[PDB]
Amino acid sequence: MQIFVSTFVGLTIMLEVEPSDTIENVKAKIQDKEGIPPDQQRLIFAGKQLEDGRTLSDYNIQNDSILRLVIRLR
Amino acid sequence: AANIAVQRIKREFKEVLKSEETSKNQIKVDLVDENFTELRGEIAGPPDTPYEGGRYQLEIKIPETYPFNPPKVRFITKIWHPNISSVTGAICLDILKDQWAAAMTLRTVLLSLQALLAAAEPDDPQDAVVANQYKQNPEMFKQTARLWAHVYAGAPVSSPEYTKKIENLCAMGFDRNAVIVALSSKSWDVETATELLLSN
């Protein structure tokens, strides 16, 4: 299972994940691929911000789902 | 949307991400929001061309009838090239009008657009003004394109003559990009470029 993460303004990556992976697992993967620290990272799925504790299934994040990444200015 | 269209765009989007050409920072694709109907593309200028060192953003719209009609593609980044409009970014390339084939891909379009930069076809022109300068005074086209590559696409510094005349006229109150356009399209004739600029 794969998901898409994007700022929509110049960053777009694809990650390999499982439904049991946590929002923290994802931000770690984002940091590994792009070097953005997870404290810098905001992830949003269908308007609702994502909290690091829940899993992808908690938010019903499926295969090929698109996640918006916001990089907070620091 | 037709499942054939969205499945194919998703697969071709992934393919470009994982491509070797992306790994070598030659092409890339981005989402602009949570759909696959509009994409943003990016191509690196081919080496040994005025576009070298520059990067060119591409607006990419995927029609409802994909894959049986080509994507609609336009340069967002301004560029001086005979087969691309210096004003709108419109593209004249056969695979985007009458020579599209269903087996072509996002990847394939992007590398064809890169090849177009290295191999202009001036008797299938998009920009008559650019294409005539291409044919009549090749070295000026090359230096103008390198200049556009530098100011618009992040390429390294271009000919300093052109930078001079752009300075002289920018001092007279004209907008800097209007001067670039004016000077480029009037073949760096400072007179006729100034006469055109006054009608603004």
Side-chain angles (χ1 to χ4, degrees):
Chain A
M1 171 210 215
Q2 290 160 317
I3 54 161
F4 291 108
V5 176
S6 193
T7 56
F8 300 141
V9 298
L11 196 161
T12 301
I13 60 166
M14 182 194 24
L15 304 173
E16 322 228 340
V17 304
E18 295 132 349
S20 57
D21 277 346
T22 170
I23 309 287
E24 202 177 35
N25 268 138
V26 170
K27 310 221 235 283
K29 283 155 173 294
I30 295 172
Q31 159 161 277
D32 291 333
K33 225 280 202 195
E34 285 308 303
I36 318 176
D39 54 357
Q40 286 237 64
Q41 287 181 35
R42 239 193 266 264
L43 289 166
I44 322 177
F45 183 65
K48 184 73 223 161
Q49 214 157 330
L50 305 185
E51 73 149 278
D52 309 29
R54 294 266 227 165
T55 73
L56 299 178
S57 305
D58 277 320
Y59 294 105
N60 197 29
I61 279 150
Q62 313 205 237
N63 194 55
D64 292 351
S65 280
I66 299 181
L67 273 51
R68 166 177 196 186
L69 167 63
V70 183
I71 296 129
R72 305 146 65 147
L73 301 155
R74 174 109 60 69
Chain B
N3 195 58
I4 196 181
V6 314
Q7 287 322 311
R8 260 207 67 173
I9 274 299
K10 286 182 168 166
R11 156 188 341 136
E12 297 183 2
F13 193 98
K14 289 182 200 149
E15 164 189 350
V16 164
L17 291 184
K18 303 182 264 226
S19 66
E20 176 85 349
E21 295 96 348
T22 280
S23 211
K24 319 211 180 123
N25 300 316
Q26 299 293 332
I27 76 198
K28 95 183 288 267
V29 297
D30 282 274
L31 303 165
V32 292
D33 77 325
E34 59 219 280
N35 307 280
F36 285 92
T37 56
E38 183 172 324
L39 310 164
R40 176 86 16 99
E42 200 172 329
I43 54 167
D48 306 335
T49 73
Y51 320 104
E52 189 165 359
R55 295 184 60 83
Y56 298 84
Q57 297 183 26
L58 290 172
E59 169 190 290
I60 299 173
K61 302 197 171 139
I62 309 298
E64 297 275 354
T65 49
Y66 198 76
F68 311 110
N69 289 138
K72 303 274 195 51
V73 185
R74 179 187 73 86
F75 282 71
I76 302 170
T77 302
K78 299 187 76 226
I79 186 174
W80 195 256
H81 184 292
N83 306 102
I84 302 162
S85 147
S86 64
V87 186
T88 76
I91 298 155
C92 179
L93 174 68
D94 59 1
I95 62 161
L96 300 172
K97 65 199 156 53
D98 64 290
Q99 297 303 326
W100 172 259
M104 295 169 183
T105 65
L106 284 182
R107 187 180 151 260
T108 278
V109 167
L110 292 172
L111 304 160
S112 299
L113 289 172
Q114 198 179 48
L116 175 63
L117 304 205
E121 309 228 65
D123 308 299
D124 188 16
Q126 174 66 32
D127 205 292
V129 172
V130 179
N132 294 344
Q133 179 187 88
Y134 188 87
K135 211 134 216 189
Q136 285 155 221
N137 187 357
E139 184 62 30
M140 178 183 278
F141 167 85
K142 164 175 162 152
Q143 285 311 318
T144 306
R146 211 158 55 84
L147 161 84
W148 282 56
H150 168 54
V151 46
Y152 298 114
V157 165
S158 41
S159 148
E161 166 65 75
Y162 291 5
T163 302
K164 192 166 259 303
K165 297 174 162 164
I166 289 165
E167 286 322 315
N168 310 150
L169 286 53
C170 278
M172 316 185 200
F174 300 119
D175 168 88
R176 165 165 257 265
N177 280 222
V179 162
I180 291 143
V181 173
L183 277 167
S184 302
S185 40
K186 298 298 190 255
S187 287
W188 299 91
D189 191 332
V190 277
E191 171 152 335
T192 74
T194 313
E195 196 57 35
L196 168 73
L197 280 160
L198 289 156
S199 313
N200 265 356

